[PDB]
Amino acid sequence: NVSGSVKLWVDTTQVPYYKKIVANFNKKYPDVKVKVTQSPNGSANAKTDVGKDPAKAADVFEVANDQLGSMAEAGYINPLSPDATKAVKNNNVAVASEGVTWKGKMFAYPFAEQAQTIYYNKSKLTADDVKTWDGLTAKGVLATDFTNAYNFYPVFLSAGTQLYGKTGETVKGTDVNSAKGEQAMAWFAQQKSNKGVMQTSNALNQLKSGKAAAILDGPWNSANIKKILGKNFAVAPYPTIKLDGKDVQMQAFLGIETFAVNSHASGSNQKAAATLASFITNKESQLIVYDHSGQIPVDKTAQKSSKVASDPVAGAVMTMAKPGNSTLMPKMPQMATFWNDAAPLINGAYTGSIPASQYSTKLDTFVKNISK
């Protein structure tokens, strides 16, 4: 039998359907008392929401896979048991297991596959128009945010550099301090004068108001964008960009969204928390998430279900996940420093605060900063 009390943190607009999932959980586990709330600052900030006071934080919380190495090394999350590991590994696609594994051990329960795509108004742009960045932006406005390194760091990967080495596990393996890194910096700088590229802190609002024909966004907004665009909804994988005069696919990050168990819990509450985390990331629960938000399951069977297989967003995400089209976010503890330093590097190139004469110096300093 499973008993105990568990606090669950989810992202703000997810609460209504996690309440439905928790109702399903309580059919099987009637004696577990779950309190579902939004988190203080969302899954993109889980490591600090938990770290500021682990005993006060939720017992089960939503967290993106890049944060897991930091949280594991800090002792905020424990390895999954052998049986829990086997379930994750057997039920979900390979990259989901890679996403939650740190030094050979799993530290979270994966449930969704996240890659950004182009979302666009098909009354304004065609499927052919969105194949290239310059071609798209010559025909309509793309709204985006150059202060967000999750949006734009992958251009360095398109340029042929590595982030923490071949597989994201090599502390000294970022090699962006090179001519290839400079090519990415120059691409950011070019976009400042591209009249079809609109800098904004709220790209989705620009799509809603009609000021943008296209945005880059992820599947957490799939159902949201389908509602906004209605019969004009369309989606595509990322386009090619020109780097050093060559067309290359513009990458996104591949992220795995997860739930983790707070290591503070003990006794019955710990068992209840692990049971909840397993349940809310099971196939049925992943399909409920899909039905509400459009997020893409990592469960092998769910991905091949008719409804997911016919969804154009799922198809675009599956394309994005292929080698060359994205890179799995690394989960090194150093990712904290990476994210902090990457945003001003990219935005400085875009705004011109970093001129071309300084690209090499700034990239050298960046690599030193993130490679300790």
Ligand X SMILES: OC[C@H]1O[C@@H]2O[C@H]3[C@H](O)[C@@H](O)[C@@H](O[C@H]4[C@H](O)[C@@H](O)[C@@H](O[C@H]5[C@H](O)[C@@H](O)[C@@H](O[C@H]6[C@H](O)[C@@H](O)[C@@H](O[C@H]7[C@H](O)[C@@H](O)[C@@H](O[C@H]8[C@H](O)[C@@H](O)[C@@H](O[C@H]9[C@H](O)[C@@H](O)[C@@H](O[C@H]1[C@H](O)[C@H]2O)O[C@@H]9CO)O[C@@H]8CO)O[C@@H]7CO)O[C@@H]6CO)O[C@@H]5CO)O[C@@H]4CO)O[C@@H]3CO
Select 137 or 258, whichever has its Cβ closest to ligand X: 258
Would you count residue 66 as binding ligand X (CB under 6 A)? yes
Query: Of the ranges 63-71, 77-85, 100-108, 227-235, which one interacts with ligand X (CB under 6 A)?
Result: 63-71
Give pairs for 136-139: CB < 8 Å, separation 24+: 136/196, 136/214, 136/239, 137/194, 137/195, 137/196, 137/197, 138/196, 139/196, 139/213
CB of 213 to ligand X, least distance (A): 20
Would you count residue 111 as binding ligand X (CB under 6 A)? no
Q: What's the start-to-end Cα distance of the chain, in Å?
A: 46
**Are the C-beta atoms of residues 32 and 3 closer than 8 Å to each other?**
yes
Q: Which of 256, 253, 44, 254 is nearest to 156 (CA)?
A: 253
Select 125 or 296, whichever has its Cβ closest to ligand X: 296
CB of 81 to ligand X, least distance (A): 25
Strand 233-236 to 4-10 pairing: unpaired
Query: Of the ranges 19-27, 146-154, 303-311, 350-358, which one interacts with ligand X (CB under 6 A)?
Result: 146-154
Write out the two tokens for 48. Answer: 């600090």
> Which member of 12, 167, 301, 353 binds ligand X (CB under 6 A)?
12
Select 66 or 129, whichever has its Cβ closest to ligand X: 66
> Which member of 5, 20, 42, 98 binds ligand X (CB under 6 A)?
42
Specify which residues 171 forms β-bridges with. Answer: none
| Cα angle: 84, vertex 87, 92; to 5 degrees | 130
Would you count residue 37 as binding ligand X (CB under 6 A)? no
CB of 110 to ligand X, least distance (A): 13
CB of 145 to ligand X, least distance (A): 8
> Which member of 150, 152, 188, 259 binds ligand X (CB under 6 A)?
150
> The tokens 């209605």 sit on which residue?
230
| Cα angle: 213, vertex 201, 137; to 5 degrees | 30
Query: Which residues in 112-141 contact ligand X (CB under 6 A)?
Result: 114
CB of 31 to ligand X, least distance (A): 30
Select 275 or 327, whichever has its Cβ closest to ligand X: 327
Would you count residue 44 as binding ligand X (CB under 6 A)? yes
> Which member of 102, 107, 220, 359 binds ligand X (CB under 6 A)?
220
> Which member of 218, 239, 294, 297 binds ligand X (CB under 6 A)?
218
Would you count residue 259 as binding ligand X (CB under 6 A)? no
Query: Of the ranges 75-83, 126-134, 142-150, 173-181, which one interacts with ligand X (CB under 6 A)?
Result: 142-150
Would you count residue 266 as binding ligand X (CB under 6 A)? no
CB of 333 to ligand X, least distance (A): 11
Query: Of the ranges 61-69, 75-83, 90-98, 185-193, which one interacts with ligand X (CB under 6 A)?
Result: 61-69
- Residue 103, by phi and psi: left (phi above 0), alpha (psi -120 to 50) or beta? left
**Are the C-beta atoms of residues 98 and 285 closer than 8 Å to each other?**
no
Q: Which of 207, 209, 156, 215 is nearest to 186 (CA)?
A: 156
Could you give the CA distance from residue 241 to residue 158 in angstroms, rounded to a whole number? 9
Binding site for ligand X (CB under 6 A): 11-12, 41-45, 47-48, 64, 66-67, 114, 148-150, 218, 220, 255, 257, 339-340
